[PDB]
Amino acid sequence: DRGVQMLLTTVGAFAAFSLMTIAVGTDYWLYSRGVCKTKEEVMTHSGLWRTCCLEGNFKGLCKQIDHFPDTAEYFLRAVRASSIFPILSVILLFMGGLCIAASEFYKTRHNIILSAGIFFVSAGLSNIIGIIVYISANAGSYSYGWSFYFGALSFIIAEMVGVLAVHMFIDRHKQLRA
Amino acid sequence: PLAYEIWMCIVFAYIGVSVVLFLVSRFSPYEW
Amino acid sequence: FCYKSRAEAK
Ligand SMILES: CCCCCCCCCCCCCCCC(=O)O
Numbered sequence: 001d002r003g004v005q006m007l008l009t010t011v012g013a014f015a016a017f018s019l020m021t022i023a024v025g026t027d028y029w030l031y032s033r034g035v036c037k038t039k040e041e042v043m044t045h046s047g048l049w050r051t052c053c054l055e056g057n058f059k060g061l062c063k064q065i066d067h068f069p070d071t072a073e074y075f076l077r078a079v080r081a082s083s084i085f086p087i088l089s090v091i092l093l094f095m096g097g098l099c100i101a102a103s104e105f106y107k108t109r110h111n112i113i114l115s116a117g118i119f120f121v122s123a124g125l126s127n128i129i130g131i132i133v134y135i136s137a138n139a140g141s142y143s144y145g146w147s148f149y150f151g152a153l154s155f156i157i158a159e160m161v162g163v164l165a166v167h168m169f170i171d172r173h174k175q176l177r178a
Numbered sequence: 179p180l181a182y183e184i185w186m187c188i189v190f191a192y193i194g195v196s197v198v199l200f201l202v203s204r205f206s207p208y209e210w
Numbered sequence: 211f212c213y214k215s216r217a218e219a220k
């Protein structure tokens with residue numbers, strides 16, 4: 001039903017946006033071993049921006065990850081520093097949500113739903129490039145924390161909501177021609 | 179043979195490719 | 211899609 005489809009799409013968008021914003025702000029991306037505060041190596045929390053010291057005498061103490069501790073490597077370092085790919089995913093998800101909102105009012109345009117689909121799909125692609133960049137730059141034991149998996153779930157949900165939006169637009173234009 | 183992250187990103191890529199092929203192939207009303 | 215759309219003006 002239109003109703004159920006629209007509700008499910010709207011809920012999906014909020015979930016994806018919230019999950020990606022939580023993930024890009026929280027610091028439990030990589031449970032590894034390192035230094036909590038530099039002027040003894042212990043478990044560390046790590047995130048996109050700051051690393052934190054768990055299990056350490058200075059527990060809870062956190063320091064900004066030192067991005068930039070070979071232009072090809074400079075470019076990866078820059079992209080990982082200013083996490084444009086992850087942050088751009090949040091922006092695209094936000095823009096998509098605005099479009100789905102503007103479907104209710106200012107309706108009958110039929111092209112804003114397609115726009116929402118394009119934004120959600122594009123958000124997924126940005127998210128995945130972000131993951132690849134992160135995983136690659138974090139290679140220069142370990143384990144991925146719950147904020148990493150929050151990011152992944154955002155990708156999946158965003159793709160599903162994208163399919164729903166395109167399908168709904170198709171159904172609209174089919175009803176118009178029926 | 180392949181690391182865990184390669185497998186994970188293969189699944190992500192599979193979802194992304196499938197979704198994009200669905201979109202580009204069946205969104206234009208000028209082919210329905 | 212945009213091109214074919216503008217054409218529909220015809
Ligand atoms: C065609 C789609 C197939 C999807 C298959 C997914 C199956 C899930 C398997 C879970 C293994 C995850 C390993 C955990 C790694 C870790 O410790 O961080």
Ligand SMILES: CCCCCCCCCCCCCCCC(=O)O
Binds near residue numbers: 181185186188192
């Ligand atoms: C679409 C092609 C099918 C591929 C699906 C394979 C999913 C594998 C998921 C990861 C499990 C293997 C990696 C080891 C993880 C670990 O060390 O715990």
